[PDB]
Structure formats: C-alpha cells, structure tokens
Amino acid sequence: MRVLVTGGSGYIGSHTCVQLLQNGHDVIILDNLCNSKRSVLPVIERLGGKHPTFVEGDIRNEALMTEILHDHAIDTVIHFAGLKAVGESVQKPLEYYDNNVNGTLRLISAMRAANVKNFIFSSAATVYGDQPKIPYVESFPTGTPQSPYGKSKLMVEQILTDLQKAQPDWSIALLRYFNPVGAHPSGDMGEDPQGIPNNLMPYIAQVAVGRRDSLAIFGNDYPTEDGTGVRDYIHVMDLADGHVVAMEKLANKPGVHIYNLGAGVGNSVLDVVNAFSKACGKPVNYHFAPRREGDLPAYWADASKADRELNWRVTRTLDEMAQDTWHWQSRHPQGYPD
Amino acid sequence: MRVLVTGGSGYIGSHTCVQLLQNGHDVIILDNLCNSKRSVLPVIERLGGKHPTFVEGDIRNEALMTEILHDHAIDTVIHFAGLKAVGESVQKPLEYYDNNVNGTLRLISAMRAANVKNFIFSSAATVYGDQPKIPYVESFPTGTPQSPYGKSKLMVEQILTDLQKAQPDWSIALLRYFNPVGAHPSGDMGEDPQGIPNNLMPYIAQVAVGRRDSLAIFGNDYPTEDGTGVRDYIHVMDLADGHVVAMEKLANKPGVHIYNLGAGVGNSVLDVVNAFSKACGKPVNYHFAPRREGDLPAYWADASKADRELNWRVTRTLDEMAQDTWHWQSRHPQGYPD
Ligand SMILES: NC(=O)c1ccc[n+]([C@@H]2O[C@H](COP(=O)([O-])OP(=O)(O)OC[C@H]3O[C@@H](n4cnc5c(N)ncnc54)[C@H](O)[C@@H]3O)[C@@H](O)[C@H]2O)c1
Ligand SMILES: NC(=O)c1ccc[n+]([C@@H]2O[C@H](COP(=O)([O-])OP(=O)(O)OC[C@H]3O[C@@H](n4cnc5c(N)ncnc54)[C@H](O)[C@@H]3O)[C@@H](O)[C@H]2O)c1
Ligand SMILES: O=c1ccn([C@@H]2O[C@H](COP(=O)(O)OP(=O)(O)O)[C@@H](O)[C@H]2O)c(=O)[nH]1
Ligand SMILES: O=c1ccn([C@@H]2O[C@H](COP(=O)(O)OP(=O)(O)O)[C@@H](O)[C@H]2O)c(=O)[nH]1
Ligand code: NA
Ligand code: NA
Ligand code: NA
Ligand code: NA
Ligand code: NA
Ligand code: NA
Ligand code: NA
Ligand code: NA
Numbered sequence: 001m002r003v004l005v006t007g008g009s010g011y012i013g014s015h016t017c018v019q020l021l022q023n024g025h026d027v028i029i030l031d032n033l034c035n036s037k038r039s040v041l042p043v044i045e046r047l048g049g050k051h052p053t054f055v056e057g058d059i060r061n062e063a064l065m066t067e068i069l070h071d072h073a074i075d076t077v078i079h080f081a082g083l084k085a086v087g088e089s090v091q092k093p094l095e096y097y098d099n100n101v102n103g104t105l106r107l108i109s110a111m112r113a114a115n116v117k118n119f120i121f122s123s124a125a126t127v128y129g130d131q132p133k134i135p136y137v138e139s140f141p142t143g144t145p146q147s148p149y150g151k152s153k154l155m156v157e158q159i160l161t162d163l164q165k166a167q168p169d170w171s172i173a174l175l176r177y178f179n180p181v182g183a184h185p186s187g188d189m190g191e192d193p194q195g196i197p198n199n200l201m202p203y204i205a206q207v208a209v210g211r212r213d214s215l216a217i218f219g220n221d222y223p224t225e226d227g228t229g230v231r232d233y234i235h236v237m238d239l240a241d242g243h244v245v246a247m248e249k250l251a252n253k254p255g256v257h258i259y260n261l262g263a264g265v266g267n268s269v270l271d272v273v274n275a276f277s278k279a280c281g282k283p284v285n286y287h288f289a290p291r292r293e294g295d296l297p298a299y300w301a302d303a304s305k306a307d308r309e310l311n312w313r314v315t316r317t318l319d320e321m322a323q324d325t326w327h328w329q330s331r332h333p334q335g336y337p338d
Numbered sequence: 339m340r341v342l343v344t345g346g347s348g349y350i351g352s353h354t355c356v357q358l359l360q361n362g363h364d365v366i367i368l369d370n371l372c373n374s375k376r377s378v379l380p381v382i383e384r385l386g387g388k389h390p391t392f393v394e395g396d397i398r399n400e401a402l403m404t405e406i407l408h409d410h411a412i413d414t415v416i417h418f419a420g421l422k423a424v425g426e427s428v429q430k431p432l433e434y435y436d437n438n439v440n441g442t443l444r445l446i447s448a449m450r451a452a453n454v455k456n457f458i459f460s461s462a463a464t465v466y467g468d469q470p471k472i473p474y475v476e477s478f479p480t481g482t483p484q485s486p487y488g489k490s491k492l493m494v495e496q497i498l499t500d501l502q503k504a505q506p507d508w509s510i511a512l513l514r515y516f517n518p519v520g521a522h523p524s525g526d527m528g529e530d531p532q533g534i535p536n537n538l539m540p541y542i543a544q545v546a547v548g549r550r551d552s553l554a555i556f557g558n559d560y561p562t563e564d565g566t567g568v569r570d571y572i573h574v575m576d577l578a579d580g581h582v583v584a585m586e587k588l589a590n591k592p593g594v595h596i597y598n599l600g601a602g603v604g605n606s607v608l609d610v611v612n613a614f615s616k617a618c619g620k621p622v623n624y625h626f627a628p629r630r631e632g633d634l635p636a637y638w639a640d641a642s643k644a645d646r647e648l649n650w651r652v653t654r655t656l657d658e659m660a661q662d663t664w665h666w667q668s669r670h671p672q673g674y675p676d
Contacts, residue, residue, distance in 0.1 A: 093500035094447055101493075102440045109432055148500045155439075155493050162431035162486045 001251065002026045002073050006059055006107065007080030008052070009036040011191045012122065012177075014044055015184055015240040016078065021048025023244050028072050030065075031081065032058045035194070039336040043189050059103040065110030076118035076251050077111060078243060079104065082152075085198055089149035100152035101159075108163060117170040118251045120243065123157055125178050125232075125260070125299065126150035135232075135302035138176075138258045146294045164256045171253050173246050178262030178301050182235035182321040183328035190328030191236075192335035200272060201233075201321070205329040208280045215284060217269050219291030222298065228269035230298035232262040235316035235324070245312050262301025263314045275322040280330075339589065340364045340411050344397055344445065345418030346390070347374040349529045350460065350515075352382055353522055353578040354416065359386025361582050366410050368403075369419065370396045373532070377674040381527050397441040403448030414456035414589050415449060416581060417442065420490075423536055427487035438490035439497075446501060455508040456589045458581065461495055463516050463570075463598070463637065464488035473570075473640035476514075476596045484632045502594045509591050511584050516600030516639050520573035520659040521666035528666030529574075530673035538610060539571075539659070543667040546618045553622060555607050557629030560636065566607035568636035570600040573654035573662070583650050600639025601652045613660040618668075 003020060007013045008029030014036070020027050021044070029041075029052050038054075045051050053072070057064050059081045068074070082100045083089070089096040108119065127150070128136045129143020145151045157174050164170045181201040183190030197203045206212045220227045242261050250257050277284045306312045316324075341358060345351045346367030352374070358365050359382070367379075367390050376392075383389050391410070395402050397419045406412070420438045421427070427434040446457065465488070466474045467481020483489045495512050502508045519539040521528030535541045544550045558565045580599050588595050615622045644650045654662075 090500075091504060093497065093504050094443065094450070097443055097497050097500075098447070102443060105432065105435055105440060109436070112432070148497075151496055151500070158489055159431065159435050159486075162428075162435075162489070166429060166431050 001247065002028070002075045003078055003247065004028045004030055004068060004072065004074045005078045005080065006030045007082065009033065009038070009040050009054070010080060012180060012236060012239060013080040014040050014189055015236045016080070016243045017044050017052055018048040018184065018189070019240040019244050021050040021052060024050070027052035028068065028074065029054045030057055030059070030068060032056065036192070037336040037338070039338070040189065047184060047186060047189060059107045060098070062106040062110045065107050066113045069110055069114035069116050074116055076120070076247055077107070077116060078120040078247060079107060080122045082122070084149060086147050086149045087198065089147050093148040096148045096152050101155050104156045105159065108160070112167070117167070119160070119170065120173045120175060120247055121156065121160060123174045123176045124150070124153050125176055125301070127154045127157060127176060130296065131299070134298065135264065135300045136260060137302040138260055138305050161256050169254055171250050172256050173250050174256060174258040175243070175246065176258070176260045177239065178232040178234050178260070180236050180239055181233050181325060182237060182316065183324040184237065185324055187324070187327035187331040190325065190332070200269065201325055204273060204276045204284055205325055207286070208276060208282070208284055208326060209329055209333055213285065215273065215286035216289040217286055218289055218295060220288040224268060224298050226268050226270050229295060230266040230268050230300070232265060232300035233267055233272065233318060233321055234261060234263050234314055235321045238314040238316050242306065242312050245310050249310055259306045259310070260301040260303055261306065262303050264301055264303040266298055266300040267318055271318070272322070275318050276326065279319065279322040279326045339585065340366070340413045341416055341585065342366045342368055342406060342410065342412045343416045343418065344368045345420065347371065347376070347378050347392070348418060350518060350574060350577060351418040352378050352527055353574045354418070354581045355382050355390055356386040356522065356527070357578040357582050359388040359390060362388070365390035366406065366412065367392045368395055368397070368406060370394065374530070375674040375676070377676070378527065385522060385524060385527060397445045398436070400444040400448045403445050404451045407448055407452035407454050412454055414458070414585055415445070415454060416458040416585060417445060418460045420460070422487060424485050424487045425536065427485050431486040434486045434490050439493050442494045443497065446498070450505070455505070457498070457508065458511045458513060458585055459494065459498060461512045461514045462488070462491050463514055463639070465492045465495060465514060468634065469637070472636065473602065473638045474598060475640040476598055476643050499594050507592055509588050510594050511588050512594060512596040513581070513584065514596070514598045515577065516570040516572050516598070518574050518577055519571050519663060520575060520654065521662040522575065523662055525662070525665035525669040528663065528670070538607065539663055542611060542614045542622055543663055545624070546614060546620070546622055546664060547667055547671055551623065553611065553624035554627040555624055556627055556633060558626040562606060562636050564606050564608050567633060568604040568606050568638070570603060570638035571605055571610065571656060571659055572599060572601050572652055573659045576652040576654050580644065580650050583648050587648055597644045597648070598639040598641055599644065600641050602639055602641040604636055604638040605656055609656070610660070613656050614664065617657065617660040617664045
C-alpha cells in the first residue's frame with residue numbers, strides 16, 4: 001500500500017516505518033522535525049530495507065498535506081505527528097491544541113480534499129480518564145483526561161468519530177497506546193528524547209548511562225503490591241507490528257475501529273527498575289519521591305479485542321524491552337547525530 | 339472600553355453591539371458575513387447611537403486578528419462568531435470543528451500575541467449534555483453533547499479553561515445561552531436566518547408571515563405538562579444586556595467566570611405558539627410531528643448565579659419575545675436588504 005506516515009521520523013513512527021517497508025509498502029514520511037532528526041532517515045531505510053520518501057513539513061499546512069496526498073497516490077495515512085509532553089501541555093495548552101487538534105483537523109481535511117479515506121490515529125490510555133475499572137476495555141465509555149495533552153487526544157478521537165459518521169466510507173482506527181518502551185533489536189534505532197526525559201524507561205536509561213544521578217520514583221504508597229505505580233509496558237516493535245496489521249487489515253473496512261495496544265499485564269516501577277539493572281549489569285540508582293500530580297496508581301490494557309479481531313498480541317517481554325533500550329542507549333549515547 | 343465583537347453583525351452580536359454603543363464603549367465588529375449582511379451595520383449604528391468600526395474577515399485568520407487587536411487597542415473580546423446549525427453540524431462536522439474549535443483557537447492565540455486578556459465566549463446549554471437534573475446549574479459537571487456543534491462548544495470551554503490556568507491573569511466568561519428569541523423593540527433589527535429556520539421562534543414567525551404552511555411540533559408525548567418540549571426562552575435584548583454587564587464587571591477580574599444566561603423558567607412549544615398567535619392576531623397553524631432526533635424533553639436555566647454575582651436577570655417577558663419577533667418579521671419580511 002501507499003502510506004503517508006506523519007511523525008514518521010519520531011520514536012514510534014520510525015520503528016513503524018521500518019516494519020512497513022519490510023512488508024514492502026511504499027512509505028512517505030511527513031515530519032516537521034521539532035522532535036526528531038533527519039539523521040534517523042538513513043537508519044530507517046537501512047533497517048527497513050527499502051527507501052522511504054521524506055518530506056519536511058507540518059500537519060497544520062493543509063495545502064501541503066493535500067498536495068502530498070495526491071502527489072503520492074496515498075491509500076492510507078498513519079497519524080503519529082503531534083506534541084506529547086504532559087507536563088508541558090499544562091504549561092502551554094495552546095500549542096498542544098494547535099498541533100494535535102488543529103493539526104489533525106487540517107490533515108483529515110486535506111484527506112477529504114484528496115479523496116483519501118483510510119486512517120490510523122495514535123491515541124492513548126489517557127482517554128479513559130479516571131477509570132477505576134481495570135483493565136481498560138474499548139467498550140468503556142471515555143472519561144475526562146486531566147491534561148491538555150490527554151484532552152487533545154480525546155477531542156481528536158471525537159472529531160474522527162463524527163467525521164466517519166458523516167463520511168461512512170472511511171476506515172478509521174483509534175489505536176490507544178499504553179506505555180511504549182524499547183528499541184529496535186539492532187540497537188541503532190530507539191527513543192531519542194531531548195533534555196529531561198518525562199517517561200520512566202528513558203529516564204532510567206540515562207541514570208544507567210551515567211548521565212543522571214538517581215531515578216526519582218514518584219510515590220511509594222499506592223495501593224499496589226509494592227506501593228509504586230503499575231503500568232502496561234509495550235515494546236515499540238510490537239506496537240510497530242500492530243500498526244502494520246491494523247493498516248493492512250482495516251483498509252477499506254468502513255467504521256471506527258478502536259483498539260487498545262498493550263501487553264495486557266501490569267508492571268510496577270520497581271519491576272521496571274529491576275529489569276533494567278538486570279539488563280545493564282549494575283544496580284540502577286533510585287530514590288522515592290512524592291507522587292506525581294494527576295497520576296493514577298495502576299492501569300493496564302485489556303487487549304483481547306485486538307487479539308480476536310486482528311490476531312495481534314505482543315510477543316516481546318519486559319526483559320527485552322529493558323535490554324533493547326539499554327543496547328540502543330549504550331551504543332548511541334548521543335542519540336541521533338546532528 | 340475597547341471591545342472587539344466577533345460575529346458582531348449576526349443575531350445576538352448585532353443586538354449586543356447596540357447596547358455596547360449605548361453604554362458608550364468603542365466597538366469593533368469582526369465578521370466574515372457567512373451568515374449576516376453589511377446591511378445591518380447602519381442599523382446598528384443608528385440604534386446604538388454611535389459608529390462601530392467594521393472589519394470583514396475570518397476568526398481563523400490569526401494574523402489578521404492579531405493586527406486588529408493591536409491596531410484598535412482592544413481591551414476585551416466578545417466571541418460570537420462561529421457556525422451553529424445543529425443538524426448541519428452532524429452532516430458536516432469538519433466545518434464546525436474548524437470554525438468553532440480552530441476559529442476560537444486562532445482568535446485566542448492572536449489575543450496572546452497582542453497581550454489582550456479579557457474574553458467573553460458564546461457558549462450553550464448543550465454543554466450540560468444529557469442532564470436529568472433541571473434546572474441546569476453552573477456547578478454541575480458538563481456532560482457529552484450529542485452533536486458536533488455541541489461538542490465544539492464544550493471543547494472550546496475546555497481549551498479556554500486550560501488557557502486561563504496557564505495564563506492566570508486572564509479573565510474569561512463562559513456564557514451559556516439557553517434559547518435566544520426576540521428582536522430589538524424598534525422592529526428594525528432581529529434574527530434573519532437564511533432558508534429554513536432551525537429554531538422554533540423564527541419558524542413560527544415564518545408560518546405567521548404566510549411563508550410557511552404549518553409549524554411541525556416535534557413530539558407531543560414528552561413527560562411534560564402538555565406533552566411538548568419545554569425550554570427557557572430568553573429575549574435577545576436581555577442577553578445583550580447580560581453581555582454588557584459581564585464585560586464591564588469581569589474585565590481584569592482573573593478567572594473563568596461561568597454563567598448560565600436564561601430566564602430561569604420553562605415554557606412549552608404550545609406556550610410559545612400561543613403567545614405568538616396572540617401577538618400576531620391570528621391562530622398560528624401547527625401540527626404534531628415525531629420527536630426530533632436527540633431532543634431532550636425539558637430543560638431550563640438556574641440563573642441565580644448571574645443574579646447574585648452580576649446583579650443581572652431577565653426583564654422581558656415571553657409575550658414581549660413573541661411581539662418583538664412579530665414586529666420585526668412583519669416590518670421586514672425580506673430581512674436585511676441585499
Ligand atoms: N510515546 C508514548 O508514550 C505515547 C503514548 C500514547 C500516545 N503517543 C502518541 O504517539 C505519537 C507518536 O509518539 P512518539 O513517542 O513517537 O513521539 P515523537 O515525538 O518521537 O514523535 C512525534 C513526531 O511528530 C513530529 N511532529 C510534531 N508536531 C508536528 C507537526 N505539527 N507537524 C509535523 N510533524 C510534527 C515530531 O517532529 C516527531 O518526529 C504521538 O501522537 C504521541 O502523542 C505516544
Ligand atoms: N442563537 C442561538 O440559539 C444560540 C444558542 C447558544 C449559543 N449560540 C451561539 O451564540 C453565537 C451567536 O449566535 P447567533 O444566533 O447570533 O448566530 P449568527 O449566525 O447570527 O451569528 C454568528 C455570526 O458569526 C459570523 N461568522 C461565522 N463564522 C465566522 C468566522 N469563521 N469568522 C468570522 N465570522 C464568522 C456569521 O457571519 C454571523 O454574522 C454563536 O457562537 C452561536 O453558536 C447561539
Ligand atoms: O521519572 C519517572 C517517570 C515515571 N515514573 C512513574 O512510572 C510510571 C510511568 O510513568 P510515565 O510517565 O512513563 O507514563 P504514564 O503511565 O504516565 O503514561 C508511572 O507510574 C510514573 O509515576 C516515575 O516514578 N519516575
Ligand atoms: O420547528 C421546530 C423547531 C423547534 N421545535 C421544538 O421547540 C423547542 C426548541 O427547539 P430549538 O431548535 O429552537 O432549540 P433547542 O432547545 O433545541 O436549543 C424544542 O422543544 C424543539 O423540539 C419544534 O417543535 N419545531
Ligand atoms: Na483515494
Ligand atoms: Na450524513
Ligand atoms: Na524533550
Ligand atoms: Na543527541
Ligand atoms: Na492589552
Ligand atoms: Na503554568
Ligand atoms: Na440558515
Ligand atoms: Na432576505
């Protein structure tokens with residue numbers, strides 16, 4: 001298929017592009033480079049085994065999106081582009097609403113204009129809001145996300161749903177990601193956050209690499225087995241694979257196809273820390289800190305639906321997530337070259 | 339004060355501009371004319387007793403908004419501009435999200451750029467969603483609006499709330515309108531819908547004027563006194579006045595000030611029909627039809643808060659709403675001149 005992968009040079013998108021190319025699809029990457037570098041492009045091609053076309057540009061530029069769509073006879077679009085720092089979204093709400101809400105709106109508007117009707121959207125577990133019922137199931141009604149970031153995701157899901165109702169021939173997949181971690185097994189592609197990493201894994205990796213002192217564990221008094229927060233970590237390669245399958249199996253299948261993408265099990269901060277120490281050969285330094293504002297104690301995905309409907313399920317383990325992350329971090333301590 | 343009134347040439351905005359000018363404020367009207375005509379401008383000035391400046395343009399044009407803001411040293415913005423046909427929003431969701439969600443986002447982004455921090459937003463009762471608890475109170479948590487239109491309003495309220503949190507010096511009023519009806523007492527300014535009117539009052543007026551055959555009453559089996567739908571009708575002049583007061587009393591008062599703007603009492607479709615027949619001197623023709631998709635049986639506003647906090651309450655009656663509407667309709671059967 002001919003697929004436009006917005007945000008394709010970023011963390012999840014890069015790994016997805018590799019898998020797509022390996023499945024022999026024709027890949028057009030669209031990215032504005034606000035959170036990634038052109039240096040990953042060659043890695044993508046080398047690992048994917050085929051050349052993906054790259055276009056530097058912004059999802060907010062509807063005219064350009066329209067042109068790309070038509071120019072490359074795209075059949076389906078995989079929407080990863082956007083801003084995702086939670087804390088920052090609280091501080092700079094407008095930029096989140098613009099890049100995520102308007103960003104998507106301009107993109108799907110461009111699609112309408114070019115007669116493209118197959119879409120995959122990067123959504124998140126945050127859409128569930130404060131849900132006491134875990135694991136989270138697609139059938140659950142959504143709640144109220146606590147941050148501008150979370151809200152922007154849910155708003156897009158709603159807009160996409162209304163669009164589909166209005167243009168019933170569209171196929172739209174709402175992929176709710178849990179906690180993406182890991183890196184390509186080669187160790188030459190992985191997450192390359194700039195500055196202080198907001199997520200657990202990359203932070204741990206930086207402590208392990210010798211860049212940071214200690215991992216601050218946000219809260220140790222939660223109603224969990226070990227008192228630390230529990231989440232559903234999912235390896236980026238498994239996420240990538242789920243994206244190829246969703247794209248191939250849902251194209252031209254009208255509807256709004258919602259799927260949680262997670263392993264279906266929970267792991268605590270300590271469990272993650274422990275796996276990492278194991279992977280890197282030395283105890284990871286850490287300390288307990290107060291609970292992070294807005295955090296839930298525990299949640300994980302109910303991934304039965306994707307298993308059933310798409311025959312997709314995770315295959316990488318927590319140890320692999322940790323080992324792959326350390327391999328990339330250690331092989332490329334400065335991330336992607338400038 | 340120096341106020342930019344977006345959508346100022348439309349129904350509610352036109353009447354608001356008149357009241358503003360009567361209070362001697364300097365008024366800049368911004369409208370794209372998609373649902374109003376330049377012909378109302380002179381009426382505004384004549385009834386307002388002062389000249390308002392008019393700029394033809396779109397809220398989506400952030401550069402222009404920014405320029406207007408700075409150029410006119412605006413102190414406060416009253417945001418009426420947007421699309422509001424419910425049924426149509428279901429059919430053309432994107433246009434609603436664009437004009438309302440993006441439209442507002444571009445406008446407040448322009449404000450940020452120009453250092454403007456006083457805003458009034460035209461919100462609606464739809465934000466309450468399916469609320470069994472009536473009357474509706476500002477303290478109630480919001481629900482899930484059933485149409486793209488309703489959703490777009492709630493999304494804006496959320497964006498505005500996050501913005502205020504991020505920029506705590508801002509004063510933002512969320513004015514939730516109930517069922518605006520009526521016309522300026524002169525009979526020379528009023529609602530001028532194009533095509534089939536979606537709201538009850540204008541439809542009734544058109545039946546009364548001899549343009550339409552019969553009023554279709556959507557449903558006669560509701561759990562209400564007379565079986566027809568019950569709402570809180572509020573005269574446009576009262577709404578207008580509430581806007582002047584909100585603007586004058588909340589400017590430079592940091593916070594998100596939410597107020598329901600309604601009369602605080604309910605009236606049925608039949609009650610409205612009856613008042614109109616009374617006003618126009620002849621029985622209004624009507625028939626019973628099936629319930630309109632998504633309609634609630636009954637709802638009205640709890641307007642205590644605005645009374646208490648702003649010392650504002652309605653002063654026009656249902657009969658006046660009907661008489662003023664008929665006077666305008668009858669004096670100007672073709673609406674505003676082309
Ligand atoms: N990483 C996670 O834990 C997590 C969890 C759920 C959802 N998501 C979502 O998945 C998607 C991908 O996440 P990621 O981890 O790969 O992040 P990422 O930052 O690595 O990738 C996003 C990419 O989008 C690009 N981009 C940002 N705004 C753009 C715009 N306006 N126009 C064009 N390009 C733009 C960035 O340059 C970057 O390459 C995002 O939508 C994110 O919100 C991620
Ligand atoms: N009339 C009601 O019953 C009702 C109830 C609640 C909320 N509202 C809201 O109150 C506001 C005013 O409603 P109204 O009855 O006066 O409607 P209206 O159509 O008469 O006024 C809206 C005005 O905005 C202008 N406009 C539309 N999109 C624009 C854009 N992108 N850029 C610039 N101008 C644009 C139109 O030309 C029109 O003059 C709207 O936001 C509406 O959703 C109205
Ligand atoms: O420096 C960090 C980052 C994360 N966490 C915890 O690790 C889990 C995952 O946090 P993350 O930000 O990666 O993702 P989230 O679950 O919030 O989407 C949660 O229980 C966080 O409290 C932590 O203790 N320290
Ligand atoms: O042609 C019409 C228009 C409206 N209504 C009813 O009148 C009330 C007000 O409808 P409207 O569309 O004006 O406003 P809403 O309350 O839906 O915001 C509701 O009970 C509608 O069902 C009706 O019976 N016929
Ligand atoms: Na096509
Ligand atoms: Na339709
Ligand atoms: Na960063
Ligand atoms: Na680097
Ligand atoms: Na100012
Ligand atoms: Na802040
Ligand atoms: Na119309
Ligand atoms: Na006319």
